[PDB]
Amino acid sequence: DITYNMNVVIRCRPMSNSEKNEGAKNVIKIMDNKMIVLLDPSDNTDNVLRQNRTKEKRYCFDYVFDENSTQEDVYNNSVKPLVDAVIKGYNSTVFAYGATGAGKTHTIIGYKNEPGIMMMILQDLFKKIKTLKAMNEYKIKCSFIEIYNENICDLLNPSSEYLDLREDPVKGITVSNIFEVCTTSVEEIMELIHTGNRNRTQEPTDANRTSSRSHGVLQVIVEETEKGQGLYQQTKKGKLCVIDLAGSERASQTNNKGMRMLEGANINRSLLALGNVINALVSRSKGTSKSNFIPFRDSKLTRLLKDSLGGNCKTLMIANISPSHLSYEDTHNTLKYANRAKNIKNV
Amino acid sequence: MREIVHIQAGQCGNQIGAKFWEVISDEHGIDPTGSYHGDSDLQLERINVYYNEAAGNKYVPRAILVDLEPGTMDSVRSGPFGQIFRPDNFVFGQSGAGNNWAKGHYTEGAELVDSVLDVVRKESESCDCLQGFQLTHSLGGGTGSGMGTLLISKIREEYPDRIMNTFSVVPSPKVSDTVVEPYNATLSVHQLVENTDETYCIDNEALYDICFRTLKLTTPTYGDLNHLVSATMSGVTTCLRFPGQLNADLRKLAVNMVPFPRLHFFMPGFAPLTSRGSQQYRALTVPELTQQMFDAKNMMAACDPRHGRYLTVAAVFRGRMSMKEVDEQMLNVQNKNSSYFVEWIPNNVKTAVCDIPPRGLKMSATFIGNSTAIQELFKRISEQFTAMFRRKAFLHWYTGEGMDEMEFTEAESNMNDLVSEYQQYQ
Ligand SMILES: Nc1nc2c(ncn2[C@@H]2O[C@H](COP(=O)(O)CP(=O)(O)OP(=O)(O)O)[C@@H](O)[C@H]2O)c(=O)[nH]1
Ligand SMILES: Nc1nc2c(ncn2[C@@H]2O[C@H](COP(=O)(O)OP(=O)(O)OP(=O)(O)O)[C@@H](O)[C@H]2O)c(=O)[nH]1
Ligand SMILES: [Mg+2]
Ligand SMILES: [Mg+2]
């Protein structure tokens, strides 16, 4: 019963001083909340090009955030309802996406500095939960893992090294040997995660000093019971999952290091697997004739996220792009992926 | 350049490997001593793909022989061609696995495996540019299945960018040789799903059918059956060993035949296949070969291609042939049998041609098909597993080797998912 719901939003970073100094032109314009236009900077020297006007490349979103949008604005207008879904006993999932160097980590997760929407996600989670806790005891557990070359690192507790995925009785997915910290405040989980970021595999690549080589996956479980512990309870374990997708890579022209080529390929493969999983879930949600298996099997990322992705859950794709023509190609591909993540012709 | 590493695990696997080696040595003009006594310079040009050159003008298979029992090793060493193998490349245990995947994967096999790993690392170091690995084994027993799988996992961890090929002899439906075969197959198939890039599904029942119906052979022995498998194996890698007009190696084949990561289970085939009597009343021509190869009754997997669709098919031709004729024949087969080919992958056929034919024949062909009918093989196995597992039959033995029920649950789930995926893409 796939009733998959995914909102797709995107954050346009403000043009940086470096981009301005390098002569960057504004390829990105927002026409509406629903749409973004990427002005492909063609010379248009031919009559055909002048007639076709391929410059106006449109992409479909639920909410395009402009250059002035902050972490608080992205939170307030996108993930806010996903947090509510978890509070109410459903799962939800947030995916950060874009070419490496796009600022995905800072917009969404942070790293001590730049709290990201993750801080905002937890901040409202805990205020609402602490209030609800008066009647229904809550245990907000938190795990943080790394999906790298299809192996899973325990980021909160690296002594478990690289782990597999297993099916639960009633076939949900568990990562073996993962540390789960029961918390009461955003300060605890946020610091826990940011500390966990220290154990992530990252490298100083040409496109990004801190390029993630892996998908950073947060799993916050809002476990609840009526405080009447001696009674039979239909408890809930809603999972608020946030994924820092590994940045897309086409930097292999210079990243000729054996491991970077391996990592690059596995990253791109699994980003595409996510894409295919999303396309399948959307098609089933739409109720198209494509009755078949959702290919969660194609990656560890999707196998694990299956538990939220195939049900009555709220998900969100948050992409990161630049207005500069100097990175037109990266913005183009980032927008293309996101457009395909949504698959709705409203634009 | 482009060296392949060969691994043989468990009795059946070893036996098949022996046959494979025998054929290939003959092909490259290598005698039982390791000396080249061939005529053609083409036989030695790419000798390094399968052989290391030892001191004093001798050649030695880049082969590792693995078993939990020593008897098999002895049998191999005493065989015709037994002396060609490097003595240090025999890695054997003393206990055996007793048809228990857990013994092979977790216990005895675990103890064994480090030696094997050490050997294969050395073998990798020796070779200038190893393209990848070929493992010959079965899924139904303990060693080839459990130990083999373990070995594969280890290999992939150290060589994640290299090509991983398995020739897996699968349990047939009717001819069930053992009682726990369903368990062993299920457990091993799961592991194969994640760690092999291409898996050649070979089935004993189908082989028997070929031997009885097509070769009209009075008494098939395992050796005869093995020969067929060996031929098929030789076919795939002919492009690495000889020149040609259109050349396709292990990687090229995989990329053309595997559209989705998990769907890498092939039904292989070989042609021509005739009796002694029916040799005279036949045309040695490409149309006939083509006709033979695409027939359902010429498949070495016990699956009806007419019960599914071909996702992709690779044909590898050996001998002096006109490209146009080859192309015509392949187009004709897809046009005439439209209903057996998925319609959303135009030109479902990949062709490769090597100028050097196998010995005794002027023309030969090898077929590799990715057919949605392979689901039948998985489905039956799944069913049998369910039948056992529902009553927890024979579970205790496995659990005594450290295995947990949950693994079984996982594997079964995985296989089911795989089956579903095949069905949907049909
Ligand atoms: N096609 C062939 N199949 C074989 C051959 N020998 C055995 N088999 C098949 O394989 C299965 C028996 O497998 P094995 O003897 O290889 C089990 P192995 O020695 O690997 O582990 P143990 O459980 O430790 O014996 C069964 O289905 C046989 O019918 C052979 O030469 N050719
Ligand atoms: N006209 C002509 N076409 C050929 C010949 N050999 C191959 N082809 C065509 O070339 C295409 C296949 O490309 P190849 O040149 O074999 O491949 P390649 O350039 O070696 O690339 P890779 O092998 O993939 O690295 C097909 O369209 C063949 O029909 C030839 O001798 N003459
Ligand atoms: Mg044996
Ligand atoms: Mg070529």
From TrEMBL, chain A:
Listed GO MF terms: ATP binding; microtubule binding; microtubule motor activity
**Signal peptide (residue range):** none
Question: What sequence ranges are listed for the domain Kinesin motor?
Answer: 5-344
One GO biological process term is: microtubule-based movement
**Keyword Nucleotide-binding annotated:** yes
Top-level taxon: Eukaryota
- Gene Ontology terms: cellular component: microtubule
Q: Where does ATP bind?
A: 98-105
Provide the alphabetized UniProt keywords: ATP-binding, Coiled coil, Microtubule, Motor protein, Nucleotide-binding
Provide the family line: Belongs to the TRAFAC class myosin-kinesin ATPase superfamily. Kinesin family.
> What name has this protein been given in UniProt?
Kinesin-like protein KIN-8B
Upper lineage? Eukaryota, Sar, Alveolata, Apicomplexa, Aconoidasida
Q: Which residues of the full protein are shown?
A: 775 to 1121 of 1460
